[PDB]
């Protein structure tokens, strides 16, 4: 789920 | 966006709430 | 004599917990029980704890009660041993030797003698390390370590306490910081920006250490750890030094952790998580070590955006240069410092959602208050009637509801059939009207324009320019709670203190950027060169739109539509002294009052007036111009602004006299040159995905930032900053 993840830990 | 509001925040219109 | 593990090279097992009377030491024992590969205890020593005859089973049952009530995992007596009776191993401090030591069986280790340590606590630091210490660092180790690590005493421990500890790396037999913190999400809980789960690794956290997601208790512990670290020491840098004396775990396995911690230490602030904010540093202070340091950015505008990666760069190590248009830095970060006592923001200064927010953070690395808003907010007709409050409860109810069925409508067009927001409002209202023969006052309808003004100023344009399917599509992702502030000493400060020390070029308006060839050829307007292996470009998006800059070779035409279907947004400020406080009687301390329209054209004409002394002693009044206003606007000069702004005080406040003003200032951004506008948002036809293909470096060379391209938090200080940490981390992968 996209919704909950950290921004800046999200930038696969 | 609506996140730029403060005086009189507009509430609908949102999402269903998500929980984890 | 052999180890009951499969494939142990426990070529010589020893009883380390030698408990019982009958320990085997270092001889025959029916069975050596395999904790690690240099750990192994004696089935004499098994049967001391796990036997009810004998003298350990008291101990054994304690501990077992405990790692029930307390936690979620077997209590089995490897697990007992490994928490309970495992020797410490500490490392000499000696600069020179730098050797691993066990602790004898009784010695409890703290922080403080990790901090110290030397061995013999003769020359004691040269006798021979245990062979079994170089053996931790055999990528096979790790596979063969029966029980995965759990830290006691960690700093993290006192904000997990809804957790089971052994879920997020901790001990089950275990047990003043800023409130704006909050880095973890609690069991089933809404989403907020910037938290981590504590028990689960995110995505770019498992792309980077894929050896952890078999087992990721390791990670975790030691992730969780550092952040708790940073948030109660953000004044300095936190270094491996600082961490290791908080990694309390028996056993060998505690060499493995103060390996890793490393690893984990340079990932988290390579990608801004910790180490951050307005921390400055150098030159033998580099936060990233020497193998990131050989390469060379330029960045190209000094606001929010550019000078968040400027600072992670330069403390990473990386050697940058900031080129500006203008002859100052801040971008549509601009303070009034020459009200009396009272620092005035002619671009931003309100913090929305202070939560987990780095605005909120660099408050504390500077030790700068905000002042958290009321909920208040009258809303006062011309000339002098504050608005009923079941009338103000109705007008509000109704405007919501139209939004609720713009949001109905939307679920299943694309963006192919996208229409303004405000025409589909209208349409709704119109269709609202007619359906149930209701009949609205024409005050309830001009109630109704505020609101309307108001989604105009968070947009920042005419709601009939603005997609009805897009408008609020960043709510999509999690978005920062708590608190709004006006930040009062104003954003300068942290603008001010992101640049000190960095190389700044002012008045130097890049014109050309050159990608071709072997490294990245800058030119100003008047023909000086820069040159550089990264450019980042930080320009606002209206500068975009225009094209004021060549790229050569040309943004691609999937960029193009990505930039033109966005908005630049505008709104303007105007700020008023007065001689005294002359709203008082009437506001009574409120932070903020609405200005009711007087008809739909005129309705983001000064629609709400900001006190500006939240001790409420000077008297300052902030407004604001949107939609439709801002072009009624242009041709006037500031001096008739003020008039309207004055006449429409006097009709507000039409029952008594107000002083006239003894100071003001009007903006033009939107005919600032290298600026032109106030923030972006959602065209009618665009999508969100707009700002992640705008954020899309190109060939890992060149790299864009801003708030137009943030998707999550778009149009905000914060959102520039965190698209500079972002592309900064992009920047030092490479
Ligand atoms: C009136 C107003 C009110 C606002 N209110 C708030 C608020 O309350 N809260 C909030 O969070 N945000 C607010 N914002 C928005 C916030 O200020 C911006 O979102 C943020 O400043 C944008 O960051 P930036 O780094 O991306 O760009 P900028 O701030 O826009 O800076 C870009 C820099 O690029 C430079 N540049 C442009 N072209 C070139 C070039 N060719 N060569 C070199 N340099 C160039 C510009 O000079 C500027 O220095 C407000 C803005 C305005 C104008
Ligand atoms: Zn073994
Ligand atoms: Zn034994
Ligand atoms: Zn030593």
Redesign the pocket.
Known sequence: DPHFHHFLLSQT | ARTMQTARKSTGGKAPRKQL | RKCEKAGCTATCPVCFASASERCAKNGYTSRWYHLSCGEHFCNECFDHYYRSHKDGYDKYTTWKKIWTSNGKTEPSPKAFMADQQLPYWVQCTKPECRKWRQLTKEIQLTPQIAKTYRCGMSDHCSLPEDLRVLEVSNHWWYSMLILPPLLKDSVAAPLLSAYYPDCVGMSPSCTGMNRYFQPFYQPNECGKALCVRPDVMELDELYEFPEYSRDPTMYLALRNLILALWYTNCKEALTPQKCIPHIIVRGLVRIRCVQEVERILYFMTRKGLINTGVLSVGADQYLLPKDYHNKSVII???????LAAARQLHNFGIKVTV????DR?????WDDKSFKGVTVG???????GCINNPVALMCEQLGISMHKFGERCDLIQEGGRITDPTIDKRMDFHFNALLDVVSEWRKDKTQLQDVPLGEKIEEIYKAFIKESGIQFSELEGQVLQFHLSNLEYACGSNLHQVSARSWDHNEFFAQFAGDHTLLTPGYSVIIEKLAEGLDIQLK???QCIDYSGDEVQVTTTDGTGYSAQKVLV???LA?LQKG??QFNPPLSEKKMKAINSLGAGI???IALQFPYRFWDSKVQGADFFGHVPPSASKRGLFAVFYDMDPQKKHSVLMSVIAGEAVASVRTLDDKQVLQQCMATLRELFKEQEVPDPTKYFV?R?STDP??QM??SFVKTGGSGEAYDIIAEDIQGTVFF????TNRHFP??????YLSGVREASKIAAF
């Open positions: 190209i505008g000094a606001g929010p955006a550019g080129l500006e248009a203008k830095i801040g971008g549509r970060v002619r671009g931003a200064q309100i913090v929305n130097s308006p890049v930080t320009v606002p500068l004021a800059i709104i303007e400020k903006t951004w290298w600026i106030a923030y930032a801003g708030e137009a149009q905000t200080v914060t959102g520039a």
